[PDB]
C-alpha cells in the first residue's frame, strides 16, 4: 500500500478563490490606521444636509462665490448632497468639548463630469483641536504622513492657497516625475469664526485641519492613470489589487 497508493503531488488543491478589496477602500483603511496609531478616532454621519450644516457653519456665509463653484446638487432651498465632509466634524465639535481630535472619511458630490472628474470622489477631512499647536506642528505631521504613505522617494513644497473654512491656508503639492509637481492635499489652521459659533473660545484654543483626495492619492501610488476606471468596476482591473 505504501509504495503503491501514491497520488499526483502538484495538482491544484480545492478551495474558493478569495477576492480583494477596492483600492480607495485599501487607501482609506491604510490612512485610517496611520492616523489611528496617533490617537485619532473616526467619525461618521449623513450624506444629505441642510445649509446650516454644509455652508453656513463653515463661515462661507451665503453671498460668497462658493455656492456655484462647489457645483452642488440642490433639492429645494435647504437640502443638498454633501459637498465636503465637514458636517460630520461640526456635529462632533458642537456636542462635546474641547481638547480631542477626529478624522472622517466619506463621499462628496460635485457636478463635474469629464475624463478627469467623476461626480463622486472620496475625501478625508481631518480635524485637531487642543492648546498651543501651530503651522510648525502642521508641517511636522503632514510631512510625516507623506513620508510614510510614500517610501521617501518624493519632495514636497508648502505653497499658499485659499479655502474659506480655514485661514491661514496652505497646499502641500508633492514632486512628480512625469510633469513637475502634482498637488496632493491642502491644509490650514481653523478660522476663529468657525470656532466661535460652535462653543470653543478662540482666545485660548487653536487647531488645524486637512483634506486630501483619496482617488488621486491612489492613482499616484498604484500607477493608475484613468480616473473614470475606478467606478466602472471591472473585475479584470480590480483583481490585481488583491
Amino acid at each position: 500500500r505504501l509504495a503503491a497508493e501514491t497520488i499526483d503531488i502538484s495538482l491544484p488543491g480545492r478551495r474558493i478563490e478569495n477576492g480583494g478589496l477596492h483600492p480607495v477602500t485599501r487607501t482609506i483603511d491604510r490612512i485610517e490606521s496611520f492616523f489611528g496609531e496617533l490617537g485619532f478616532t473616526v467619525a461618521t454621519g449623513p450624506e444629505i444636509e441642510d445649509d446650516y450644516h454644509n455652508f453656513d457653519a463653515l463661515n462661507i456665509p451665503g453671498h460668497h462665490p462658493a455656492r456655484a463653484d462647489h457645483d452642488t446638487f440642490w433639492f429645494d432651498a435647504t437640502r443638498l448632497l454633501r459637498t465636503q465632509t465637514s458636517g460630520v466634524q461640526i456635529r462632533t465639535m458642537k456636542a462635546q468639548q474641547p481638547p480631542i481630535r477626529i478624522i472622517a472619511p466619506g463621499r462628496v458630490y460635485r457636478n463635474d463630469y469629464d475624463q478627469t472628474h467623476t461626480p463622486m470622489f472620496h475625501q478625508m477631512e481631518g480635524l485637531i483641536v487642543d492648546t498651543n499647536i501651530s503651522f510648525t506642528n502642521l508641517k511636522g505631521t503632514l510631512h510625516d504622513f507623506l513620508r510614510n504613505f510614500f517610501e521617501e522617494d518624493l519632495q514636497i513644497r508648502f505653497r499658499p492657497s485659499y479655502f474659506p473654512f480655514t485661514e491661514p491656508s496652505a497646499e502641500v503639492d508633492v514632486m512628480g516625475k512625469n510633469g513637475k509637481w502634482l498637488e496632493v492635499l491642502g491644509c490650514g489652521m481653523v478660522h476663529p469664526n468657525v470656532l466661535r459659533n460652535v462653543g470653543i473660545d478662540p482666545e485660548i484654543y487653536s487647531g488645524f485641519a486637512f483634506g486630501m483626495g483619496m482617488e488621486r492619492l491612489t492613482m499616484l501610488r498604484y500607477g493608475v492613470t484613468d480616473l473614470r476606471s475606478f467606478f466602472e468596476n471591472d473585475l479584470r482591473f480590480l483583481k490585481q489589487f488583491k
Partner: protein, 238 residues
C-alpha cells in the same frame, strides 16, 4: 459711504501661537510696510491699518497670514505635535465593519462601490410603491434618483461585467440608503446598509467538484457566518 478700513491690531502672542516660529520685530514691522500697510509699532503690539486695494483684511488672521506668506512657508522648520495621551473608550460588545468585510472577502467575495444615485426607470422596477427622492438639476436622464436600496446599482455592475464575458462575479457593497419618511431629522430616513450579489457557479472547473449553479441555501449559509458567529446567534428565525 466709501469702504472704510479698520484698525487691525496684531499682538505678539497671537502671531507666535499661530506660526510657531519667532519672526523678529524688525522683520515683521517691515513686511507690512513693504506690503503696503501703514504700520505703527506699539510696545509688543502692532496697529496697522489696511491698504485700499485689498478687500481681504478685516481680522488678525488676515494680518498674520500675509506675514507668513511674505516670510515664506519653506523657511519654517518642522516639529511634531505635543499632546497628552488619553486612551479613549472602546467596547468589547460591539463589532467593527472591517472584521465583517475581512470575513466576507475571505469567504470568496469582493468589495466594489458604485454610484450612489441611479436610474428612476430601473429603480422603480425593484421598488414600486415607494416614492423616490428625485433630483433637480441632474447630470443626465439616467442619473436623477437617490437610491432606495443597493440593488439598482449592483444589478447594473453585474450586467456590466457579464457583457465582458465573465459570468462568475461575486461582489458586495456597503453604503447608506435613502428612504423617505416624515419622522427623521431631515425628511428622509437614512440607515447604513450592507448588501451584496452572488451568481455564477459555486465551484470553478475542478477535477471532482461538479457543475451546479447556486441555490438559496448556499447564500443562507454564507449570510449565517456574517450575522451569526460574529455579533448575535441563538435568537434567529426565518
Amino acid at each position: 459711504t466709501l469702504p472704510k478700513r479698520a484698525t487691525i491690531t496684531l499682538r505678539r502672542s497671537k502671531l507666535d501661537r499661530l506660526i510657531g516660529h519667532h519672526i523678529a520685530d524688525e522683520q515683521v514691522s517691515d513686511i507690512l510696510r513693504r506690503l503696503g500697510c501703514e504700520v505703527t509699532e506699539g510696545q509688543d503690539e502692532w496697529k496697522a491699518v489696511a491698504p485700499t486695494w485689498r478687500f481681504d483684511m478685516e481680522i488678525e488672521e488676515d494680518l498674520v497670514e500675509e506675514v507668513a506668506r511674505v516670510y515664506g512657508y519653506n523657511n519654517i522648520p518642522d516639529e511634531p505635535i505635543q499632546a497628552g495621551l488619553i486612551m479613549g473608550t472602546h467596547r468589547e460588545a460591539d463589532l467593527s465593519l472591517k472584521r465583517v468585510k475581512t470575513m466576507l472577502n475571505d469567504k470568496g467575495y469582493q468589495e466594489v462601490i458604485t454610484y450612489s444615485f441611479v436610474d428612476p426607470k430601473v429603480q422603480q422596477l425593484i421598488h414600486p410603491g415607494a416614492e423616490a427622492l428625485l433630483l433637480p438639476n441632474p447630470i443626465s436622464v439616467e442619473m436623477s434618483a437617490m437610491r432606495l436600496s443597493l440593488w439598482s446599482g449592483l444589478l447594473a455592475t453585474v450586467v456590466y461585467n457579464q457583457n465582458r464575458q465573465q459570468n462568475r462575479v461575486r461582489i458586495f457593497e456597503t453604503g447608506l440608503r435613502f428612504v423617505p419618511d416624515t419622522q427623521a431629522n431631515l425628511g428622509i430616513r437614512q440607515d447604513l446598509m450592507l448588501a451584496g450579489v452572488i451568481c455564477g457557479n459555486r465551484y470553478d472547473e475542478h477535477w471532482n467538484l461538479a457543475k451546479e449553479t447556486v441555490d438559496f441555501y448556499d447564500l443562507k449559509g454564507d449570510l449565517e457566518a456574517v450575522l451569526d458567529l460574529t455579533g448575535k446567534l441563538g435568537d434567529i428565525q426565518f
